[PDB]
Enzyme design. Structure first.
Site, short mmCIF file in Angstrom:
data_model
loop_
_atom_site.label_atom_id
_atom_site.label_comp_id
_atom_site.label_asym_id
_atom_site.label_seq_id
_atom_site.Cartn_x
_atom_site.Cartn_y
_atom_site.Cartn_z
N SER A 52 0.80 -1.20 0.00
CA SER A 52 0.00 0.00 0.00
C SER A 52 0.84 1.26 0.00
CB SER A 52 -0.94 0.01 1.19
OG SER A 52 -1.88 1.02 0.86
N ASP A 76 -9.86 -4.93 -4.67
CA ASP A 76 -9.33 -3.91 -3.75
C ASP A 76 -10.17 -2.61 -3.84
OD1 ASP A 76 -7.77 -2.01 -2.31
OD2 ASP A 76 -5.97 -3.25 -2.62
N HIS A 106 -7.94 -5.76 -0.03
CA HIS A 106 -6.71 -5.10 0.42
C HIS A 106 -6.06 -5.94 1.51
CE1 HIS A 106 -4.16 -1.59 0.00
NE2 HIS A 106 -4.14 -1.37 1.31
#
EC number: 3.1.1.1
Lengths: 218, 218
Positions: free
Chosen positions: B114, B168, B199
């Site tokens: 991320s 996601d 995620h």
């Protein structure tokens, strides 16, 4: 105030679905679903309200269609409850106005995706005292439910269909699931469906919703 | 200024994987993963830094480990280029310390989940003008790749592995895909792998990473 969209069914309306969008969408966002659904629900009207354009705090005060302010994502999912109650109220007024057109309140349904679904839970199970057809709640949760929530006799009689993706990273399956339990624990006739997806809508999800409504209309 | 977690390999280290965690998490987030991989990469050292503790604006100024400020989400995203550059600057520092340690730049890899990945993209392909083993980007994108992106001869020679979840909802699959495409158009050897997930990280994906690396050091 942008007016709701109203989509005429194939025959004359004897049922209604009021359907609220999520954060940042508009009244058009669920037109394709409404229209798809109207291929088999021949006498169901679909009303597609738009949230007021207001500053959204996680978005930097960017003004967009919003049912209520979200202020932090995490930890605390913190929101504006006053705004939420003003929306729940606007939806209540929509239910009343549909009744006046001659649709019976046992055949008005409230539906809501994300932000919109939070308002539908509050309107139905906190505000509404009459007959109602159904709550359909898509990829959503109920930030105004908790252990103190009590349903009237009339509110228990409102069935509820609850849908979610396994892979939702914006409203966790767990939050969606908490709202369902809350009513399950309390006598409400309530169904749960999960699909392999994220914060979105699938074709098979729409089909299922179409089946549940038709079962409620029949 | 909390210090890295250095996991030492089973044999004298001759490689290094610097792994940066995501927003809100800590340097222990990937410790399990690094240990899983080391059972395979027997000479490969893992140093897991921690993002400094800052206000995050979109989380309500709640202070948490954070590689740079996220000021808004939609419809135009906004971040801190300043803190991103001091995070970038501090990765490059973790690198030239591994070098001094006695590792060669060609078997130092950068890895990111991320928010960490956006920092590793910026350091590999914007700052670093030397040899590097490669970049592993997980569930991420490149806030600082635009149309004007121009790679150097040595930056083009760094290989990358971009991995992402189909569903996601935090960093859209498209945002991860676009980073892959800016890198591909510009002469970079990139590989894209997608997974049925949100995620998060999967076992397969961690298996896919270890395989990739065993080829890079093979």
């Amino acid at each position: 105030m942008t007016e709701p969209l109203i989509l005429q069914p194939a025959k004359p309306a004897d049922a209604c679905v009021i359907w609220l969008h999520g954060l940042g969408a508009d009244r058009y966002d669920f037109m394709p679903v409404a229209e798809a659904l109207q291929e088999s629900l021949l006498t169901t009207r679909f009303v597609l309200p738009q949230a007021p354009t207001r500053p959204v705090t996680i978005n930097g005060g960017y003004e967009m269609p919003s049912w209520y302010d979200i202020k932090a994502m995490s930890p605390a999912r913190s929101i504006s409850l006053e705004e939420l109650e003003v929306s729940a109220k606007m939806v209540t007024d929509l239910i009343e106005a549909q009744k006046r057109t001659g649709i019976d309140a046992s055949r008005i349904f409230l539906a809501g995706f994300s932000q919109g679904g939070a308002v539908v839970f509050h309107t139905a199970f906190i505000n509404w005292q009459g007959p109602l057809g159904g709550v359909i709640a898509l990829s959503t949760y109920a930030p105004t439910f908790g252990d103190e929530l009590e349903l009237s006799a009339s509110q228990q009689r409102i069935p509820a269909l609850c849908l979610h993706g396994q892979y939702d990273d914006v409203v966790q399956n767990a939050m969606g699931r908490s709202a369902f339990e809350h009513l399950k624990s309390r006598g409400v006739t309530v169904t749960w469906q999960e699909y392999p997806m994220g914060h979105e809508v699938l074709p098979q999800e729409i089909h299922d919703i179409g089946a549940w409504l038709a079962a409620r209309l029949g």
